[PDB]
Amino acid sequence: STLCHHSLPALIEGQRKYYADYYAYRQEIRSLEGRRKRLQAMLNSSSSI
Amino acid sequence: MDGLSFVDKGKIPDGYKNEIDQLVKKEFANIKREPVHPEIRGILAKRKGADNSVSTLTNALYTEYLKQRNNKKRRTPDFNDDDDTLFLEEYRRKYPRIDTSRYIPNESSEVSLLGIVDSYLKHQEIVLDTLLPQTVSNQWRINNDYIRQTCTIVEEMNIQQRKQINDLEIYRKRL
Amino acid sequence: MLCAISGKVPRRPVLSPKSRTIFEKSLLEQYVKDTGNDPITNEPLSIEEIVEIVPSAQQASLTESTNSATLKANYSIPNLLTSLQNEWDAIMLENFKLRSTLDSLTKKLSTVMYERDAAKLVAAQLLMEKNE
Amino acid sequence: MLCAISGKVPRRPVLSPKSRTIFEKSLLEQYVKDTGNDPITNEPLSIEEIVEIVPSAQQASLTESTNSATLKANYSIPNLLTSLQNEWDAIMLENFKLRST
Amino acid sequence: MLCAISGKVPRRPVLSPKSRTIFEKSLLEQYVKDTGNDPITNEPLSIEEIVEIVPSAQQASLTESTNSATLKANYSIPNLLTSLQNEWDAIMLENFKLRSTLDSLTKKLSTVMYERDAAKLVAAQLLMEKNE
Residue B4 within any structural domain of the chain: no
**What span, in angstroms and rounded, lies between the C-alpha atoms of C103 and C115?**
19
The single-letter code of the amino acid at E81 is L
Q: Is the distance from CB of C82 to CB of B38 less than 8 angstroms?
A: no
CA distance C131 to chain A (A): 24
Q: Domain limits at B63?
A: 12-174
Sheet strands side by side (includes E21-24) = E21-24, E13-16, E51-52
- CA distance between the termini of chain C: 91
Q: C26 burial class (0-12, 13-18, 19+ CB within 10 angstroms)?
A: middle
DSSP 8-state class, residue E37? B
Q: Which of B27, B139, B146 sits opposite E118 (nearest CB)?
A: B27
* CA distances, D42 to each of C56, C84, C112, D8 (Å): 14, 36, 74, 22
Residue B96 within any structural domain of the chain: yes
Interface present between D and B (3 or more CB pairs within 8 Å): yes
Q: Could you give the residue ranges of the DSSP H alpha helices within chain B?
A: 14-30, 38-44, 53-75, 83-94, 111-126, 132-174
Please tell me what resolution, in angstroms, this structure has: 2.3
* CA distances, C120 to each of D18, E116, E121, E124, E131 (Å): 84, 8, 10, 11, 19
**What span, in angstroms and rounded, lies between the C-alpha atoms of E102 and E38?**
22
* Side-chain half-sphere CA neighbours of B94 within 13 A: 14
Contact state of D85 with E84 under an 8 Å Cβ cutoff: no
Sheet strands side by side (includes C21-24) = C21-24, C13-16, C51-52
DSSP 8-state class, residue A3? I
Contact state of B128 with E85 under an 8 Å Cβ cutoff: no
Cβ-based neighbour number of residue D92 at 10 Å: 22
By residue count, chain A amounts to: 49
Contact state of E102 with C106 under an 8 Å Cβ cutoff: no
Q: Which helix (H) or strand (E) holds C14?
A: strand C13-16
Residue E14 CA, chain-centre distance (Å), reads 16
Q: Which of D77, D84, D85 sits opposite B57 (nearest CB)?
A: D77
Q: Could you give the residue ranges of the DSSP H alpha helices within E1-132?
A: 25-35, 57-65, 77-131
CA distance C101 to chain D (A): 25
Chain breaks in chain B (C to N over 2.5 A) after: none
**What span, in angstroms and rounded, lies between the C-alpha atoms of C118 and E50?**
44
Residue B170 within any structural domain of the chain: yes
Residue B125 within any structural domain of the chain: yes
3-state secondary structure of B2: coil
**What span, in angstroms and rounded, lies between the C-alpha atoms of E106 and E96?**
15
Question: Which residues in chain D touch residue C75, judged by CB atoms under 8 angstroms apart?
Answer: 71, 83-84, 87
* Side-chain half-sphere CA neighbours of B16 within 13 A: 20
DSSP 8-state class, residue C44? B
CA distance B57 to chain D (A): 7
- Method of elucidation: cryo-EM
Q: Is the distance from CB of E94 to CB of B88 less than 8 angstroms?
A: no
Domain count, chain B: 1
**What span, in angstroms and rounded, lies between the C-alpha atoms of D47 and D44?**
10
Closest CA to E49 of E58, E57, E41: E41
Q: Is the distance from CB of E5 to CB of C92 less than 8 angstroms?
A: yes
Give me Rg for the CA atoms of chain E: 24
**What span, in angstroms and rounded, lies between the C-alpha atoms of E99 and B64?**
13
Q: Is the distance from CB of C114 to CB of A20 less than 8 angstroms?
A: yes
Closest CA to D9 of C83, C76, C9: C76
Angle at the Cα of C100 from the Cα atoms of B28 and E46, rounded to 5 degrees: 135
3-state secondary structure of E43: coil
3-state secondary structure of B51: coil
The single-letter code of the amino acid at C104 is S
3-state secondary structure of E104: helix
* CA distances, A24 to each of A18, A31, B61, D73 (Å): 10, 10, 41, 55
Q: Helix (H) and strand (E) counts for chain C? A: 4, 3
**What span, in angstroms and rounded, lies between the C-alpha atoms of C117 and B148?**
42
Closest CA to D40 of D24, D49, D28, D53: D28
**What span, in angstroms and rounded, lies between the C-alpha atoms of C114 and E112?**
10
Residue B7 within any structural domain of the chain: no
3-state secondary structure of B19: helix
Contact state of A20 with C118 under an 8 Å Cβ cutoff: no
**What span, in angstroms and rounded, lies between the C-alpha atoms of C47 and C29?**
6
- Contact of E95 with chain B, judged by CB distance below 8 Å, is answered with yes
* CA distances, C76 to each of C47, D34, D73 (Å): 36, 24, 16
Determine phi and psi for E66, rounding to 5 degrees: -70, 135
By residue count, chain B amounts to: 175
Residue B149 CA, chain-centre distance (Å), reads 25
Locate the DSSP E strands across C27-111.
51-52
3-state secondary structure of C9: coil
Chain E, nearest residue to B143 by Cα: E66
Give me Rg for the CA atoms of chain B: 30
The single-letter code of the amino acid at D60 is A
Angle at the Cα of A40 from the Cα atoms of A39 and A45, rounded to 5 degrees: 100
Contact state of C93 with E122 under an 8 Å Cβ cutoff: no
Interface present between A and E (3 or more CB pairs within 8 Å): no
Calculated CA dihedral for residues E43, E48, E54, E59, nearest 10 degrees: 50
**What span, in angstroms and rounded, lies between the C-alpha atoms of B85 and B83?**
6
Signed CA dihedral, B115, B119, B125, B130: sign only: positive
Q: Is the distance from CB of B123 to CB of B101 less than 8 angstroms?
A: no
3-state secondary structure of E65: helix
Closest CA to E113 of A28, B41, B20: B41
Q: Is the distance from CB of E67 to CB of E33 less than 8 angstroms?
A: no
Q: Is the distance from CB of B147 to CB of B140 less than 8 angstroms?
A: no
Q: Is the distance from CB of C47 to CB of C28 less than 8 angstroms?
A: no
Residue B6 within any structural domain of the chain: no
DSSP of C117-130:
HHHHHHHHHHHHHH
Contact state of E98 with C93 under an 8 Å Cβ cutoff: no
The single-letter code of the amino acid at B4 is L
Q: Mapped to the 3 state alphabet, what secondary structure does chain D carry? A: CCCCCCCCCCCCEEECCCCCCEEEHHHHHHHHHHHCECCCCCCECCCCCCEECCCCHHHHHHHHHHHHHHHHHHCCHHHHHHHHHHHHHHHHHHHHHHHHC
Q: Which of E34, E91, E113 sits opposite C91 (nearest CB)?
A: E91
Closest CA to B95 of B58, B144, B145, B148: B58
Give me Rg for the CA atoms of chain A: 21
Which residues, in sequence order, are CB contacts of A5 under 8 Å at separation 6+?
none
* Side-chain half-sphere CA neighbours of A6 within 13 A: 8
Q: What is the largest CA-CA distance in chain D?
A: 45
Residue B1 within any structural domain of the chain: no
Contact state of E92 with B34 under an 8 Å Cβ cutoff: no
CA distance D77 to chain E (A): 9
Closest CA to C126 of B48, B19, E34: B19
DSSP 8-state class, residue E52? E
**What span, in angstroms and rounded, lies between the C-alpha atoms of E52 and E75?**
32
Q: Enumerate the β-bridge partners of residue D51.
A: D15
Chain D, nearest residue to E92 by Cα: D77
Q: Is the distance from CB of B74 to CB of B66 less than 8 angstroms?
A: no
Q: Is the distance from CB of B112 to CB of D89 less than 8 angstroms?
A: no
**What span, in angstroms and rounded, lies between the C-alpha atoms of C10 and C16?**
14
B-C CB pairs within 8 A amount to: 62
Cβ-based neighbour number of residue D74 at 10 Å: 14
Cβ-based neighbour number of residue C43 at 10 Å: 12
